[PDB]
Design a protein around this nucleic acid. Structure first.
Ligand code: 6CF
Ligand code: CL
Ligand code: CL
Ligand code: CL
Ligand code: MG
Ligand code: MG
Ligand code: NA
Ligand code: NA
Length: 326
DNA sequence: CCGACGGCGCATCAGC
DNA sequence: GCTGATGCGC
DNA sequence: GTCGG
């Protein structure tokens, strides 16, 4: 909030480029700038001052000077007053509707919540659930509720097979006081980078969570990644809790560290860390860290026994989860 | 200048 | 049916 | 939109 006005602005611009312009690199450029400025420990006084930060160039510097002097950005003022842009931006807030589908729906005249509700038949499964819980999915989850959800998840998976280990990652692992959803990393000794000695490992867990009515809907589901909806149980006469988004990722037990590093995020932190990795001659994904041979092709996985080992390879001092919120 | 920008799971679809 | 490209998401 | 070779 120290430079909240500016970071909000950049984030709006980022969303515009992504949702309306369908210019993903501009989206990432604005988010990185917003990110680096967000952690700058001083109340920015000018675009020039901001341009010193990495990720902030000439264009954003000018915008920062406009925002600082007028308190607003004409470029955004116009975007807001543009019906097509406003429609597209709104529609993309429904989970399952991205930049493309939003523009297409608008072409059909489907541009409001009311339009979507009356044309449910024109949405795929994911979009339909996103619409169904539109209001709920925008609500934040207090950490206290995250704690209650964690308890249910770990206890239920334990009941399935005491050998499963479920770790809540995402902003929760980063110590956030509220999260947008729950991200669960799941491992089991039967599934390694060497073999899958037991099928349905993810399925069984999803099944159990559905049996107890924790998981209520499914957006997508595969062998290693589940994307759905869940809800905490409420007491008698007690109003129900909002439905929440839940992501479950099954990862080879031997590649847990690259996995937890990936799922802990933040997304921008991963982008920055993986970019740094490449500059240092390495490539990092959720399974391994590999050196990039002279040719440019990834080599064999390097030994990893802690999150810190990954950091050492790329010559970065270790950073606790709570400091990875970029 | 201008090529690169992190990396990948699941749903859907065109082409064969 | 498969496979590769695209959309959307983590 | 920003960066580095
Ligand atoms: N583009 C991305 C997106 C995600 N992630 C990894 C790194 C992320 O930490 C992790 C979770 O994705 P999430 O989509 O639940 C998130 F990001 F919003 P979270 O950080 O959890 O914040 P919140 O509380 O609001 O959900 O996936 C990634 O690597 N790249
Ligand atoms: Cl772009
Ligand atoms: Cl690992
Ligand atoms: Cl790999
Ligand atoms: Mg999350
Ligand atoms: Mg998530
Ligand atoms: Na800069
Ligand atoms: Na969406």
């Amino acid at each position: 909030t120290l430079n909240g006005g500016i970071t909000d602005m950049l984030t709006e611009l980022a969303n515009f480029e992504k949702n309306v312009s369908q210019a993903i690199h501009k989206y990432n450029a604005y988010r990185k700038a917003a990110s680096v400025i967000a952690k700058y420990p001083h109340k920015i006084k000018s675009g020039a001052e901001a341009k010193k930060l990495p990720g902030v160039g000439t264009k954003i510097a000018e915008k920062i000077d406009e925002f600082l002097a007028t308190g607003k950005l004409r470029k955004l003022e116009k975007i807001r007053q543009d019906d097509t842009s406003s429609s597209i931006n709104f529609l993309t807030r429904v989970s399952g509707i991205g930049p493309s589908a939003a523009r297409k729906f608008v072409d059909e005249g489907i541009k409001t919540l009311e339009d979507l509700r009356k044309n449910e038949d024109k949405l795929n499964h994911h979009q339909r659930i996103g619409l169904k819980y539109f209001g709920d999915f925008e609500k934040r989850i207090p950490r206290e509720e995250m704690l209650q959800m964690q308890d249910i998840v770990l206890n239920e998976v334990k009941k399935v097979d005491s050998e499963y280990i479920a770790t809540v990652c995402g902003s929760f692992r980063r110590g956030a006081e509220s999260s947008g959803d729950m991200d669960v990393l799941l491992t089991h000794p039967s599934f390694t980078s060497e073999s899958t000695k037991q099928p349905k490992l993810l399925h069984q867990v999803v099944e159990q969570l559905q049996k107890v009515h924790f998981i209520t809907d499914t957006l997508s589901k595969g062998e290693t990644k589940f994307m759905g909806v869940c809800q905490l149980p409420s007491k008698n006469d007690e109003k129900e809790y909002p439905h929440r988004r839940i992501d479950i990722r099954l990862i080879p037990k031997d590649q847990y560290y690259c996995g937890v590093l990936y799922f802990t995020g933040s997304d921008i932190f991963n982008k920055n860390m993986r970019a740094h990795a490449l500059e240092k001659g390495f490539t990092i994904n959720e399974y391994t860290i590999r050196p990039l041979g002279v040719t440019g092709v990834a080599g064999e996985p390097l030994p990893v026994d802690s999150e810190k080992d990954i950091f050492d390879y790329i010559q970065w001092k270790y950073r606790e989860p709570k400091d990875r919120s970029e």
